[PDB]
Design a protein around this ligand. Structure first.
Ligand SMILES: N[C@@H](Cc1c[nH]c2ccccc12)C(=O)O
Ligand SMILES: N[C@@H](Cc1c[nH]c2ccccc12)C(=O)O
Lengths: 101, 101
């Protein structure tokens, strides 16, 4: 059932319903309460850490091992982060270099 | 070590940086690739489902058991959603009723 075409199309629309919800929360300055509701504390912590991983990977100064030890993350976490950043569109990465660095 | 005011301070700074990066991404129409970068596929799926949990809990029509069975979720997931909703500030909750119902 989970691997069906119907379940996949529903999943895509459900995700975008969240994205649009959050867009509107930011517009009405309800983003912080919404994200407190919608996420667990450990998810929020992971997201704060992932920002630093992306930042430091784009910066290119720390090695992936240095980065793991600085953040208390596992090597595999850093590697997933690196894989995802490698796959990101150029337009995002270019912007991230502007705003994160 | 993770259980200190210093680490709580740092975690919040890091979380707010994510929140503000994403705020900025929405302003620049880069939210979609940023969320693809920063979240896993199971995380996005879970967020899409949690929007439905919150929607159906506010609607008040389905029982929590009906909800669990419709979404293929555990009872305890529905319970966590219900707990967070009961604790939500009224401004957030009223706005969710507005936009989701
Ligand atoms: N998009 C990534 C999410 C992710 C996992 N670990 C990370 C570490 C850093 C940055 C992003 C990530 C993925 O699907 O795997
Ligand atoms: N803020 C909630 C996140 C959550 C977990 N499961 C949910 C189900 C529905 C809505 C929100 C949630 C929490 O910390 O537990």
């Amino acid at each position: 059932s989970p691997y069906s075409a119907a379940m996949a199309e529903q999943r895509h629309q459900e995700w975008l319903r969240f994205v649009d919800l959050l867009k509107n929360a930011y517009q009405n300055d309800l983003h912080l309460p919404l994200l407190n509701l919608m996420l667990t504390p450990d998810e929020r912590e992971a997201l704060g850490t992932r920002v630093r991983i992306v930042e430091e990977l784009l910066r290119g100064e720390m090695s992936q091992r240095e980065l793991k030890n600085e953040l208390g993350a596992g090597i595999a976490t850093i590697t997933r982060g690196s894989n995802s950043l490698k796959a990101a569109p150029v337009e995002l990465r270019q912007w991230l270099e502007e705003v994160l660095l």
